[PDB]
Amino acid sequence: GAMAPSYRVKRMDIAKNDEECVVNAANPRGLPGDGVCKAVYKKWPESFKNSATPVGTAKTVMCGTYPVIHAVGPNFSNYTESEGDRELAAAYREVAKEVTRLGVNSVAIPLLSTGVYSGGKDRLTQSLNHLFTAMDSTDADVVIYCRDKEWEKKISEAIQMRT
Ligand SMILES: Nc1ccc2ncccc2c1
Ligand SMILES: Nc1ccc2ncccc2c1
Ligand SMILES: [Cl-]
Ligand SMILES: [Cl-]
């Protein structure tokens, strides 16, 4: 575990993380996809061997000795708000199990279902709160990666509010 487990946020490409493992915002089919998933495919393509997994689950594939945790958030275009919310919480619980099993001291994580799976809605608070529910009982240092400068500010404030 980390000596003093923390949450941090960085505004940069998760493919350039400084953590001991990465969470992919995967699609269920293990396809290269777009956004975070495409960046992860370009950096760790070997990790996409038999990575296909259902919505609400996480599957880890090693790139050399570097673990890539493929986490499949719901596409809110297809799911009801109620069912999507359940699957989004579940995906994060499976990430917490995998991070614990791997025995890593740190993990890089994107906010699941906030991009092309958002169904055109702002889900920063929804997705972050499910991330905290899952990861609060783990002792890994968590580093959240985002792109938008105003999202960085909002994520940073939400972390600081609990400290
Ligand atoms: N500041 C950022 C955040 C995310 C990115 N993703 C890919 C490429 C450049 C990026 C820059
Ligand atoms: N957390 C994020 C958000 C968007 C990105 N786009 C490309 C590559 C990495 C990225 C990480
Ligand atoms: Cl997404
Ligand atoms: Cl963002």
UniProtKB/Swiss-Prot annotation:
Q: Where in the cell is it found?
A: Host cytoplasmic vesicle membrane
Q: How does it sit in the membrane?
A: Peripheral membrane protein
* Impact upon substituting V36A: Partial loss of mono-ADP-ribosylhydrolase activity
Record-annotated Macro domain positions: 4-163
PTM: Phosphorylated by host on serines and threonines.
Effect of altering Y117 to V/W?
Almost complete loss of mono-ADP-ribosylhydrolase activity
Q: Which domain of life is it from?
A: Viruses
List positions binding ADP-D-ribose: D13, N27, G35, G115, V116, Y117
Effect upon mutating D13A: Partial loss of ADP-ribose 1'' phosphate phosphatase activity
Q: How does it assemble?
A: Interacts with mRNA-capping enzyme nsP1. Interacts (via C-terminus) with host G3BP1; this interaction inhibits the formation of host stress granules on viral mRNAs and the nsp3-G3BP1 complexes bind viral RNAs and probably orchestrate the assembly of viral replication complexes. Interacts (via C-terminus) with host G3BP2; this interaction inhibits the formation of host stress granules on viral mRNAs and the nsp3-G3BP2 complexes bind viral RNAs and probably orchestrate the assembly of viral replication complexes. Interacts (via C-terminus) with host NAP1L1.
Q: What does this protein do?
A: Seems to be essential for minus-strand RNAs and subgenomic 26S mRNAs synthesis. Displays mono-ADP-ribosylhydrolase activity. ADP-ribosylation is a post-translational modification that controls various processes of the host cell and the virus probably needs to revert it for optimal viral replication. Binds proteins of G3BP family and sequesters them into the viral RNA replication complexes thereby inhibiting the formation of host stress granules on viral mRNAs.
Q: What is known of its domains?
A: In the N-terminus, the macro domain displays a mono-ADP-ribosylhydrolase activity. The central part called, the alphavirus unique domain (AUD) has a zinc-binding function. The C-terminus region, also called hypervariable domain (HVD), is mainly disordered and binds several host proteins. This intrinsically disordered domain contains 2 SH3 domain-binding sites and 2 FGDF motifs necessary and sufficient for the formation of nsP3/G3BP complexes.
- Can you say what this protein is called? Non-structural protein 3
Q: What is the lineage of its organism?
A: Viruses, Riboviria, Orthornavirae, Kitrinoviricota, Alsuviricetes
Q: Summarize which stretch of the complete protein this chain spans.
A: 1334 to 1493 of 2474
